[PDB]
Every structure is written in structure tokens, then in C-alpha cells.
Symmetry: C2
Subunit: 165 residues, 2 copies
């Protein structure tokens, strides 16, 4: 069963992870999305859901303005081939999210631990990081060190690697 935002917050509370959240209308355009980010301190995350030819799945979580070279990233992350995008059926199955609502907090839904989470080194140089708490009408801030603790608590030992250009 996919978790709700409330269930995510409760899980963070049980872990002793502090969080704050802004409620907002979902945003879509380039200027409106940026305008919203600029009101919310911290690194804002974006996620690449990918796989290799052996059907090993990864989420690469990077800062919003970072660029990943999809032709080469496999070599950094230990993938079996050049990566391909993961299709939505496995994205739903594993992370409980749909396109437009992808979030690193989706780790909580991957109870079979099919996804390897990679966190970009530069992203974690931010004191605070942001993602949607399983809903796109909220943005939640946690400490970057607590993102690691969150992932570990869901059974996902993250790889911290430089995947951004």
C-alpha cells in the first residue's frame, strides 16, 4: 500500500528527523516553479529513475539545476550498461509515484528494496534539502544528513557519488 504524506511525516517523527513543509498549489511552468523554489531555502531535489540492461533500478537524486550525462553515469554508479529510463509501471510498483510526482521520499514505498538510491555529492553540500512528501501540493525541507538517515531507515543504503557534471 502506497504511503500518504501524513504517514511519511509520522515515520520521520519516529526517526527524530525534523521537518518543515510549505503547502502550495502544484506548479508546472518554468517560471512559476522557480518562483516557488526561490521562496523555500535549501537544495531542491530532482530525480532520475533509470535502469541498466540487467534490470537493476536506480534513482539518481540531484539538485534541480544539475546535469547528469546519461551516456556515462553508469560507470560512476556501478551499473551493468549505459542506463535507460525506467518506465512508469515499475516506477509505480517500486516508488508508488507517477510522472510529475517523482520524489526521493518514494523510497518509503519500495519495500522490496528494488531501487538503489544515489545521492549527488554536490546536493548533500547543502545544509537543507527539499522534496515533495508523496504529494505535489507540498514541499518538505529536511537536513541533508537526515535524507541519508531517512533512506537508511527504509532499508536503502544510499550511494553518495558525484553524478552531476
Amino acid at each position: 500500500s502506497r504511503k500518504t504524506a501524513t504517514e511519511l511525516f509520522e515515520f520521520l517523527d519516529g526517526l527524530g528527523i525534523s521537518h518543515t513543509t510549505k503547502q502550495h498549489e502544484p506548479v508546472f511552468t518554468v517560471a512559476e516553479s522557480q518562483s516557488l523554489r526561490d521562496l523555500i531555502p535549501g537544495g531542491h531535489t530532482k530525480n532520475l529513475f533509470v535502469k541498466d540492461k540487467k534490470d537493476q533500478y536506480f534513482v539518481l537524486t540531484v539538485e534541480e539545476n544539475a546535469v547528469v550525462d546519461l551516456k556515462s553515469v553508469h560507470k560512476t554508479i556501478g551499473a551493468a550498461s549505459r542506463v535507460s529510463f525506467g518506465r512508469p509501471e515499475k516506477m509505480l510498483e517500486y516508488l508508488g509515484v507517477v510522472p510529475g510526482s517523482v520524489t526521493v521520499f518514494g523510497a518509503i514505498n519500495d519495500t522490496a528494496r528494488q531501487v538503489t538510491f544515489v545521492l549527488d555529492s554536490d546536493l548533500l553540500e547543502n545544509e537543507l534539502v527539499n522534496g515533495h512528501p508523496l504529494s505535489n501540493d507540498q514541499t518538505t525541507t529536511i537536513a541533508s544528513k537526515d535524507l541519508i538517515r531517512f533512506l537508511e531507515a527504509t532499508g536503502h543504503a544510499p550511494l553518495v557519488l558525484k553524478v552531476s557534471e
Copy 2:
């Protein structure tokens, strides 16, 4: 309000003598799927910021997909009256004939009242070729960067070519 079809756009470009090529594709939404698609399509890929100032002067800033615009300062570069604010969907549809998820520099063809000032980032125009959705997000169309300027001019939009990216 004008809301032309992709066909109408192509015919307009044909009458201008602007060569175009288009890739048909399912619409893409995720980060990796969008990037994978861009990597198959040569040229600079465009993204657009639809903004206004306190005097309700509207602008479209068209930049390369991986560029960043400093929204706190860009008004000084483009000659706006104040720090800019995002343009809301009503006016975006009224002027450009586009909705969220389908914003495109080709929407200039819909701005028949010429309410929007188009600004092209100078770095973007160093690409020989540039890409945008031809008024539909299941296609991506490539034209020469100099032809993007010709297209804008033809629609009655003299573009400002300025460094608006960081």
C-alpha cells in the same frame, strides 16, 4: 484568442522559406525520459519563462534547457519596470495559446495583439539548430537558430537578444 495547430505552424514556416524537421514522440514527463529524448535530437533544446512586471508588461525568456535565470535580477537586463513575477495561466493562454506542460516559443504565432516581448538568450543562439514543440507536446521541431529569429520577426515580435542566463 488564437490557438493554431501544428499544421498551421508548419505552413507558416513553409511560406517563410524556413526549413523544419520534426520528430513524432509520445509526450514525456519524467526527468530521465525527457533527457533521453533530448539526447536523440540534435541542437539546442529550449525552455521558456513567461513573466511580467508591475506594469503588466509580459515577456517570454527563451533559454537553453539547462540554463538558469536569476529571477531577482533579470528585469535589469530586459528593461522591465520591476522584479518580474510569473505570468498566470489565463494570460498565457490568451497571448500564447498554450497551457502548462506545452509552453513553446512557437506560441508567438498566437500573440496576434503583440502583447508579449520575446527575449532570446544569447548563448542559446550560438547553437546552429534549436528545438521546440510545434504547438503540441507529442512533437519536437528543429529549425536553425537564425530562422527562430526570422520566425519571431514574421509574427510581429522583434526579439531582444540578451544574456539572461547565469
